[PDB]
Amino acid sequence: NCTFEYVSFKNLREFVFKNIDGYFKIYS
Amino acid sequence: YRLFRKSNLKPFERDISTEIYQAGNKPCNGVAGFNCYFPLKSYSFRPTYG
Ligand SMILES: *[C@@H]1O[C@H](CO)[C@@H](O[C@@H]2O[C@H](CO)[C@@H](O)[C@H](O)[C@H]2NC(C)=O)[C@H](O)[C@H]1NC(C)=O
């Protein structure tokens, strides 16, 4: 049932998510 | 295979929208028929084909 897997108020966290051309990119 | 659609597909996409299309005021009730055509149909591959 799987095809792919991956494993790698004082706080402000900013993220950007983009998905183009079959590529899913994140910036942090 | 899909015969007709109302939107183009971007490269490398899998879409779950495999429902019916309507071309008339009458209610199709989700059943295929005249003026209620279905986009997905087979080609019936056979050895004699070109
Ligand atoms: C990605 O999937 C969405 C969700 O199915 C598609 O959005 C639909 O597109 C059809 C085509 O015109 C519309 O009739 C629907 O109303 C849209 N929304 C839904 C919830 O089905 C979208 O078209 C797909 N991406 C591409 C490039 O086709």
> Atom 14 in ligand 1: which residue has the minimum CA distance?
B6
- Residue B2 contacts residue B42 (beta carbons within 8 Å): no
In chain A the first and final C-alpha atoms are separated, in Å, by: 30
Which of A9, B10, B7, B9 has the alpha carbon at shortest distance from B21? B7
Where b means 16+ CB within 10 Å and e means fewer, B4-29 reads: eeeeeeeeeeeeeeeeeeeeeeeebe
The answer to whether residue B12 neighbours chain A at the CB level (below 8 Å) is yes
Per the entry, the structure determination technique was cryo-EM
Q: Computed from CA positions of residues B31, B37, B39, B45, in that sequence, does the dihedral angle turn out positive or negative?
A: positive
- Residue B41 contacts residue B24 (beta carbons within 8 Å): no
- Residue B22 contacts residue B36 (beta carbons within 8 Å): yes
- Token pair 């070109």: residue: B50
Q: Cβ–Cβ contacts within 10 Å for residue B38, how many? A: 15
SS (H, E, C) A10-24: CCCCCCEEEEECCEE
